[PDB]
């Protein structure tokens, strides 16, 4: 009956966290981050075992069924604790360049490790889009989602990132739009499938830049020189026609939206 522990900065984008304890490798959770476009060193997910136990091994399934955008940390460690303050490392991992999808992390401890907490902890900046499927111990319907957002001051910068739950063989234009409170949703930027064509709304051109990385399968919106009238919820969207990707009616998929607030 362990329970889940994880970084408080994360938000659930799909699934529910009971799926990480149900004994099923094919159910999981996709996390995002409304405060930052990267998952940074120190973020973690794992188990509070509820008491001390002599651990003989672990089986943690990271990633989750299918393809899609980058979904796993590149460098991270397995570490454990008795008091939830002092951690000891068991193993470090470098999975840089791994394709999307499940990775079953199965470890056996020749001599038992006494712990009440055990977790995977990020070592290096990675996209803030992470999926996990299962956390266990041993003891004797494409969806787009945006990360990044929050409060920044005028003259400051913020970057947004959008990931997808599946990969397509087709070429999709991607676009950002935004809606300020009780104003019509408005086009912000679009980019063609191969990245070579971009266009911007009049009021952001020369301050915002759209770009994409088709290997990570991410689309970005770099927002520089921020102004109070950039305050809005920002949505990423996908359209199989670059011409209509700037129209409200064009896109076939829309993200969940992320609040951006620019104060004076
Ligand atoms: C819009 N798109 C998401 C998508 C596409 N290009 C991207 N490109 C970048 N750089 N970043 C993204 N977030 C991104 N997202 C889609 C659209 C359709 C299907 C989809 O229908 N996939 C089928 C296969 C059919 C197909 O290949 O279209 C499946 O079973 O996964 C997947 C992703
Ligand atoms: Mg599961
Ligand atoms: Mg279409």
Residue numbers in the entry: 1 to 140, 175 to 298
Task: Copy text from the publication.
Using several starting points, we evolved CID systems controlled by a therapeutic drug methotrexate. Biophysical and structural analysis of methotrexate-controlled CID system reveals the critical role played by drug-induced conformational change in ligand-controlled protein complex assembly. We chose the nanoCLAMP domain due to its small size (15 kDa), ease of recombinant production, and finally the lack of cysteine residues enabling its use in both oxidizing and reducing environments. While comparisons based on limited number of repeats must be treated with caution, the structural and biophysical analysis of the selected binders suggests that they exploit ligand-induced conformational changes in the anchor domain and do not form direct interactions with MTX.
We were able to collect diffraction data sets for complexes containing nanoCLAMP3 and nanoCLAMP8 complex and solve the structure to 2.9 and 1.8 Å resolutionrespectively, using molecular replacement. The overall structures of both complexes were very similar, and we therefore performed a more detailed analysis on nanoCLAMP8 complex that was solved to a higher resolution. The linker connecting the VHH and nanoCLAMP is disordered and is not visible in the structure, indicating that it is flexible and unlikely to contribute strain necessary to distort the structure of the complex. The well-defined density for MTX molecule is located in the cavity formed by CDRs 1, 3, and 4 of VHH domain. In the complex, the nanoCLAMP has a 700 Å2 interface with the VHH:MTX complex that forms two interaction clusters. Cluster 1 involves interaction of invariable loop 64–71 with CDR1 and CDR4 regions of VHH. Binding of the nanoCLAMP introduced surprisingly little change in the structure of the VHH:MTX complex. From this it is clear that the rearrangement of the CDR1 region (Ser199-W206) of VHH upon MTX binding plays a key role in selective binding of the nanoCLAMP. The conformational change results in the 2.9 Å movement of the C-alpha of Arg201 of CDR1 that forms two hydrogen bonds with Gly68 of Nanoclamp8. Binding of MTX to VHH leads to restructuring of CDR1, pushing it out and rigidifying thereby providing an anchoring site for the invariable loop Lys64-Asp71.
